[PDB]
Amino acid sequence: TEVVMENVTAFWEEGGTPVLKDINFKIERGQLLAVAGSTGAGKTSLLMMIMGELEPSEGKIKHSGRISFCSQFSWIMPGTIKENIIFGVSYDEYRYRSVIKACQLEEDISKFAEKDNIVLGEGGITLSGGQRARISLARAVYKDADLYLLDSPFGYLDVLTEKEIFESCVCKLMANKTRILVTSKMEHLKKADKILILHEGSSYFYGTFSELQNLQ
Ligand SMILES: Nc1ncnc2c1ncn2[C@H]1C[C@H](O)[C@@H](COP(=O)(O)OP(=O)(O)OP(=O)(O)O)O1
Ligand SMILES: [Mg+2]
């Protein structure tokens, strides 16, 4: 198993209400967990616990190895688009091209005379929200890691572009990788190995899409 939570309860503040309550799941190496639920349900907090920023008050957690985290808030640092995507990681042409293709950024980049050397975050180019999200996703996917934590990475994308990048990036390019994707979209839950739906800190549902089907 790559990630386990067993009976996990946690608090951001002593004597507050728990942000996560008796949470249980298991991800095997290479699987995809979809994490869903309304705003404030505790999804990002769950990722924060995996990254060691929040410790459990009850329960046990297992995870090992390097993490790559894609925030739900996309961000750019001053530098070229290539520098923003590799972001201090060693460069490989094939790997870089595979990521930007999977994130549909080849189309955007091809339109600039400077191509991958277009400068971001320095007042010149103003990127759309969807561009900034795809760049932030590409950065997280380019990093080599054992566990990918993708927190609602499809911000500002139309539903078809989201579907295409979910398939090309999360399902195909990252097929061998252990992935936790915070998402509410039906196809993402359907293709996930496991689904965890949170509501106000609690496990609303945990299982497979097919199991949820059989309750209807
Ligand atoms: N660093 C933090 N410190 C204190 N409280 C936090 C912190 N982060 C989140 N919270 C609080 C806010 C919320 O009351 C609760 C759950 O927040 P969070 O896990 O960010 O929800 P979420 O990620 O499911 O919502 P959203 O879909 O809007 O991103 O925890
Ligand atoms: Mg969040």
Whole-number Å distance, alpha carbon 153 to ligand 1 midpoint, is 16
CA distance 121 to 124: 7
Domain count, the chain: 1
The DSSP result for 76-103, as a single string, is --SEEHHHHHHTTSPP-HHHHHHHHHHT
Q: What Å resolution does this PDB entry report?
A: 1.9
Tell which residue, 154, 146, 156, has the closest CA to residue 170. 154
Q: Which residues contact 186 (CB under 8 A, 6 or more apart)?
A: none
Closest to 50 (Cα-Cα) out of 36, 31, 40, 65? 65
Tell me the CA–centroid distance for residue 96 and ligand 1, in Å.
33
26's CB contacts (< 8 A; 6+ apart) are 1, 3, 4, 194
Can you read off the two tokens belonging to residue 204? Answer: 């609303």
**Closest atom of ligand 1 to CA, residue 37:** 24
Q: 181: Cβ below 6 Å to ligand 1? A: no
- Residues followed by a break in the chain (C to N exceeding 2.5 Å) are none
CB 81 within 8 A of CB 118: yes
Rounded CA gap, 148 and 125, in Å? Answer: 29
Helix, strand or coil, per DSSP, at residue 196:
strand
Report the alpha-carbon distance of residue 170 to residue 86 in Å, rounded.
Answer: 18
Q: How far is Cα of residue 162 from the mean position of the Cα atoms in its chain?
A: 13
CATH number for position 190 = 3.40.50.300
Residues facing 67 on adjacent strands = 147
Q: How many CB atoms lie within 10 A of CB 19?
A: 22
Burial of 184 per CB tally in 10 Å (0-12, 13-18, 19+): middle
Cβ atoms 116, 82 nearer than 8 A? yes
DSSP H helices in the chain = 43-50, 81-86, 93-102, 105-110, 129-142, 159-165, 186-191, 209-213
User: How many CB atoms sit inside 10 A of residue 215's CB?
Assistant: 7
Strand segments (E) across 95-211: 119-120, 147-151, 178-182, 194-199, 202-207
Residue pair 194/34 in contact (Cβ under 8 Å)? The answer is yes
Q: CA 16, CA 6: separation in Å to the nearest integer?
A: 21
Query: Ligand 1 mean position to 11 CA, how many Å?
Result: 11
Q: Taking a C-beta distance cutoff of 8 angstroms, is the pair 65, 1 a contact?
A: no
Question: Which tokens sit at 100?
Answer: 């930007």
Token pair of 198 as six digits? 């949170």
Burial class of residue 32 in the structure, from the number of CB atoms within 10 Å of its CB (0-12 exposed, 13-18 middle, 19+ buried): buried
**Chain length of the chain:** 216
Residue 72 CA: which ligand 1 atom is closest?
29
Q: Tokens at residue 102, please?
A: 């999977």
Q: State which approach was used to obtain the coordinates.
A: X-ray
Which residues lie closer than 8 Å to 150 by C-beta, 6 or more apart?
70, 137, 140, 170, 179, 180, 181, 182, 183
User: What domain range is 25 assigned to?
Assistant: 1-216
The whole-angstrom separation of Cα 81 and Cα 27 is: 33
> Residue 116 gets which letter from DSSP?
G
CA distances (Å), 176 to each of 69, 146, 158, in order?
17, 10, 27
- C-beta 43 within 6 A of ligand 1: yes
Q: How far apart are CA 46 and CA 35, in angstroms?
A: 9
